[PDB]
Design an enzyme around this catalytic site. Sequence first.
Site, PDB file in Angstrom:
ATOM      1  N   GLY A  24      59.375  50.083  38.217  1.00 24.43           N
ATOM      2  CA  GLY A  24      59.466  50.514  36.825  1.00 24.43           C
ATOM      3  C   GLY A  24      60.857  50.981  36.447  1.00 24.43           C
ATOM      4  N   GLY A  25      61.903  50.384  37.041  1.00 25.67           N
ATOM      5  CA  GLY A  25      63.238  50.940  36.896  1.00 25.67           C
ATOM      6  C   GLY A  25      63.949  50.669  35.576  1.00 25.67           C
ATOM      7  N   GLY A  27      62.477  51.204  32.391  1.00 28.35           N
ATOM      8  CA  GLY A  27      61.967  52.008  31.299  1.00 28.35           C
ATOM      9  C   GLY A  27      62.839  53.222  31.013  1.00 28.35           C
ATOM     10  N   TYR A 145      43.242  55.375  33.362  1.00 27.26           N
ATOM     11  CA  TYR A 145      44.628  55.642  33.727  1.00 27.26           C
ATOM     12  C   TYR A 145      44.758  56.991  34.438  1.00 27.26           C
ATOM     13  CZ  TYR A 145      49.560  56.801  33.116  1.00 27.26           C
ATOM     14  OH  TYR A 145      50.862  57.210  33.321  1.00 27.26           O
ATOM     15  N   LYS A 149      46.026  57.691  38.441  1.00 25.41           N
ATOM     16  CA  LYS A 149      47.109  58.606  38.805  1.00 25.41           C
ATOM     17  C   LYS A 149      46.646  59.643  39.818  1.00 25.41           C
ATOM     18  CE  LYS A 149      50.711  57.237  36.613  1.00 25.41           C
ATOM     19  NZ  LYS A 149      51.804  56.720  37.405  1.00 25.41           N
ATOM     20  N   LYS A 201      61.840  56.374  12.186  1.00 26.24           N
ATOM     21  CA  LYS A 201      61.518  56.628  10.780  1.00 26.24           C
ATOM     22  C   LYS A 201      62.711  57.229  10.042  1.00 26.24           C
TER      23      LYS A 201
END
Lengths: 328, 322
Positions: A24-25, A27, A145, A149, A201
Amino acid sequence: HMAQREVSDQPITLTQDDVILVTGGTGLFGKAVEHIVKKEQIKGKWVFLGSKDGDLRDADACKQPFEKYRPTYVIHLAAFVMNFKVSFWLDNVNMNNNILTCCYDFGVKKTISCLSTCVFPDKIEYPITEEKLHEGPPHFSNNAYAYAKRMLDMLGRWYNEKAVNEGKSCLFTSVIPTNLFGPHDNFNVEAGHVLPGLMHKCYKAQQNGTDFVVFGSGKPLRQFLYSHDAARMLLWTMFNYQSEEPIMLCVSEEDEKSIGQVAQTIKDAFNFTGNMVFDTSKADGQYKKTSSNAKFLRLNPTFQYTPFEQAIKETVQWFLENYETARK
Amino acid sequence: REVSDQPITLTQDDVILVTGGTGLFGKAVEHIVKKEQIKGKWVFLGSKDGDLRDADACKQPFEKYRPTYVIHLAAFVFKVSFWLDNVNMNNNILTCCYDFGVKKTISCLSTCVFPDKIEYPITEEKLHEGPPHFSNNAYAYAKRMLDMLGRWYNEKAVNEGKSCLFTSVIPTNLFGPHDNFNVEAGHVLPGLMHKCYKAQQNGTDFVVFGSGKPLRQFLYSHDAARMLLWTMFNYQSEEPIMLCVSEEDEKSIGQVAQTIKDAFNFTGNMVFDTSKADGQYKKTSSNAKFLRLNPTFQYTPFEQAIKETVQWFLENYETARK
Ligand SMILES: [Cl-]
């Protein structure tokens, strides 16, 4: 086991022969590790895996980066977040089983995995402390999820148990980062976290001449951790922290900010001059949801956090300079 | 409601696949099925049919037998292996049940998977209210995630308009024919029978470890098989259902040993070894739910069940697990 302390006496010193594999490097959190590694010239070969590098849910595919790179350390950040709860359980538990097993089989010295605040028991007394992780069921909304974990945590303990019985030098632990923000976040206003969404926004209002609308009343309070701070905390954990108990990575309760403060800080960072208004038709989230930094504060008392305002100004400048390629 | 308006009737077109079907529990199911002339082709899987931990191998009995109903009894009992072997098998089986359109799947949990800190009697709702005891927590968490995976597949079935239901039973202290009678490795009740037999066969004294005071609820396997079949035909809730005798029917270890002695007509001496320590006094489970939903259910009295198990053991000593 009374034997070892939560920290090593000296920090681990990485050499050029060390290989650090980061799943996951690419993100928010992983890119911050890469930034700190480069900025502080941390030694070793660092490998930041991404989606194109292989399906970690597949046991054989998961073996490929370990065979290729033979890491001495692993930072496991990947998670799967066909939106069915079944998939959330299967995809996360399969990848987690594969990664941790590869770590053990390839003799990785230390493996740090990542949990998140949303896996703690739903019925809970604040402040959240790490020992409360398994004390009851999580909230139903994300419980597939959540449980993956929780079982990622347990599998590390079981692998610590195995490493001892076999006389192997393999340690497994985990960190719990709380409300990360910074460069390379997800800025989708509908699907992103509230803080990066407000940045988007605000930017959109600045381009269209529209008012800047905060969906809440602005009253709720949250603790926000700059991704670059979290990355330094994680490196400190990799170099020093020996305990299999997870460690919270968060700023103190005294540093909590309201959504209104956050949105105002964003406006000033953008130097947006139009109006900022609060849509009270939308119901406010939960008032306070405090997590505890007592353990990290006790174990690393001299650690310096980046002021919230400076972190927003840096984050906003990256967003302005990189709008085309930011995730939306 | 928890029970369907009408019971399911199996026909000759039904195919019921049973994992872990060749032990004590599966053997009782096979017996009641034959005795009551329950319809359908019943397939009792054993080790020879494939490694259910492998996702492809697990698919084979589904592609071969095309089941309409599944009874999932298999489990593996390093902590790493117990987590991985059980969680993979469970993941594979329930996924196959969904993908192949099995109408109803009943899985099996255990008493040892409930939270270590718990108020007795144990009731089904407390299953996830805290961590299990450390000693077997890999096996425990695999069972807890087997329960959750069934609920999650129930959600998918609803959202997809599919007719797949998942539920589970919690059998408590089964005993009966085809048990494991190893004196060192078997459960207390089957171990004691072999110890009493061996004492009568060597002339020695019948030695029971501990004081004989702790109390347990023991369930004859044939009763549990009737309860499980009742659950298949009638029970619609995804909530697990406890299978145990009532608290009033608990027996002490000394009562268990004496009934065994009288069942064998052992005339020698029964001594208690209090140098071995006693387990927990009572660990009482609650059958209120089954009692409320099937109030006319009649149990086999303990003495009758011990006598039946003793006769089976004697007639089949050569082939029994020892
Ligand atoms: Cl958020």
